[PDB]
């Protein structure tokens, strides 16, 4: 028997089998519904497209995300997403496969409980288990000690771990992520006359961000050089034309991660919440944590983010300490890699939540020692 | 009109191969400069370690 590893996240579902090097099914977690009339009789069109199919018909659908900030807010849409993942992208019968799911730290309890209730009643899996994303990042990184910064698409968090013991009082969670960066980039593109208002134009803006944005090493000097020269201007070709020219908002967008006041948040940047989690930990492990600062998730994929975060954390920490930032090239999939590793471990086979345990104890079995 | 946009396509091809050969020569000179930079930065990282050790 094999276990499935479904890493949902907020905006990119990626699933596969336990024991592979990568997910075999990566698609956006969107559910589209047609918003126009529909004239051709006999077209036999459907009522809701999910996944990558909804990306080809953006000009006709209104796109919803069923997961806002880690939290699932539309259970019907999420059930559709899971059905698509099981039957159309993977082509497996979920009644004969254990399933490992992930979630972010410090979410509501009903999210997790309703998740397992769905997975047992509707999809009828034999076993299941929910894992923290940062722990799986640390498995895939090849470490057992380090502070992991997992910037996804809805939520960012730090989780310090030492020798396999997680320090729950030092976990930080921040609701600034790729979706907020996309909204900020849409808002500041209007300074040059481009306007993207539709949910289908949000995707165009996301592709722009992924392809052109980067983190500046020195924000003020980059602003000065963009004001003076014109060597930063880069062009992008929309699905039609009118190539858009992007100047300093190439790096003003991801700078929101280090200055969350740009989008009117009160909190501090990711470098500063990382340092604060460190100083929140004990004193005997701070050196190892400084030396094992692990990045993962898609929002950590900008060019220059590792160097920027090292500069900031080095300016913060004492001078006698060597700061190191681990940023693999397969960061975007680290949670899935770690999930596959963990589910393939033979020690883990006693940690699943079997269906009989659930039937006898209710969905409360999930927060129990069966974590 | 076919020969017209044809001639423009050909002159675009000329200047485009110009841009391409500039791309390749530039990337050669810049990869040489790069390798030089990493040689320098590694030798100076080792020298920084030596200095802190003597300190």
């Amino acid at each position: 028997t094999t276990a499935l590893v479904c890493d949902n996240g907020s905006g990119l579902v990626k699933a596969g089998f336990a024991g592979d090097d990568a997910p075999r099914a990566v698609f956006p977690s969107i559910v589209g519904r047609p918003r126009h009339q529909g004239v051709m009789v006999g077209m036999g069109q459907k009522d809701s497209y999910v996944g990558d199919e909804a990306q080809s018909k953006r000009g006709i659908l209104t796109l919803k995300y069923p997961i806002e900030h880690g939290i699932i807010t539309n259970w019907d849409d999420m059930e559709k997403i899971w059905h698509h993942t099981f039957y159309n992208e993977l082509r497996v019968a979920p009644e004969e496969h254990p399933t490992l799911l992930t979630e972010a730290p410090l979410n509501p309890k009903a999210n997790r409980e309703k998740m397992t209730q769905i997975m047992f009643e509707t999809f009828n899996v034999p076993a299941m288990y929910v894992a923290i994303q940062a722990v799986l990042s640390l498995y895939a990184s090849g470490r057992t000690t380090g502070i992991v910064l997992d910037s996804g698409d809805g939520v960012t968090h730090n989780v310090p771990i030492y020798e396999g013991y997680a320090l729950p009082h030092a976990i930080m969670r921040l609701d600034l992520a790729g979706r907020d960066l996309t909204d900020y980039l849409m808002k500041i593109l209007t300074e040059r006359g481009y306007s993207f208002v539709t949910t289908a134009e949000r995707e165009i803006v996301r592709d722009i961000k992924e392809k052109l944005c980067y983190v500046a090493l020195d924000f003020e000097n980059e602003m000065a050089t963009a004001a003076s020269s014109s060597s930063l201007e880069k062009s992008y070709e929309l699905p039609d034309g009118q190539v858009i020219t992007i100047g300093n908002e190439r790096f003003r967008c991801p700078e929101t991660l280090f200055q969350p006041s740009f989008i009117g948040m009160e909190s501090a940047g990711i470098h500063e919440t990382t340092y604060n989690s460190i100083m929140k930990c004990d004193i005997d492990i701070r050196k190892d944590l400084y030396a094992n600062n692990v990045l993962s998730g898609g929002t950590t994929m900008y060019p220059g983010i590792a160097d920027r975060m090292q500069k900031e954390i080095t300016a913060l920490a004492p001078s006698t300490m060597k700061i190191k930032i681990i940023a693999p090239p397969e960061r975007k999939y680290s949670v899935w890699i770690g999930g596959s590793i963990l589910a393939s471990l033979s020690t883990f086979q006693q940690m699943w939540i079997s269906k009989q345990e659930y039937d006898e104890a209710g969905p409360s079995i999930v927060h129990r020692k069966c974590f | 009109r076919a020969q017209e946009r044809l001639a423009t396509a050909l002159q675009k091809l000329e200047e485009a191969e110009k841009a391409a050969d500039e791309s390749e020569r530039g990337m050669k000179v810049i990869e040489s400069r790069a390798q030089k930079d990493e040689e320098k930065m590694e030798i100076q990282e080792i020298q920084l370690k030596e200095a802190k050790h003597i300190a």
Partner: protein, 111 residues
């Protein structure tokens, strides 16, 4: 036996390539955890034997590419990982040549 002289020549050279795999040398990078080759001579000669490009084989050892859905992303490696990969490659090619030699033997014997 049924097989030509070129084929014995290829067998011998393949075994010599397996022998040349062992002397490869890798170092960590400047301020990262990535493996990069310092010695390239045995790499060049092993590629010239194997029928591949030396730079291409070095790139394939230091930076594997894996399939994530419909895209390819490059995986990172350190010295221990690249050494384990080299050893597994050598064991694989040897065992492969062995099994195929047995197939050739059985084809010669076949009535």
């Amino acid at each position: 036996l049924g097989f030509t002289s070129e084929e014995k020549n290829s067998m011998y050279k393949l075994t010599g390539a397996i022998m040349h795999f062992g002397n490869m040398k890798f170092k960590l990078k400047q301020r990262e955890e990535q493996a990069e080759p310092d010695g390239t001579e045995e790499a060049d000669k092993s590629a010239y034997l194997m029928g591949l490009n030396s730079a291409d084989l070095l790139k394939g050892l230091c930076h594997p590419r894996v399939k994530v859905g419909n895209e390819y992303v490059t995986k990172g490696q350190n010295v221990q990982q690249v050494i384990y990969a080299t050893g597994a490659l050598a064991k694989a090619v040897y065992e492969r040549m062995f099994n195929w030699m047995v197939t050739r033997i059985n084809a010669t014997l076949e009535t």
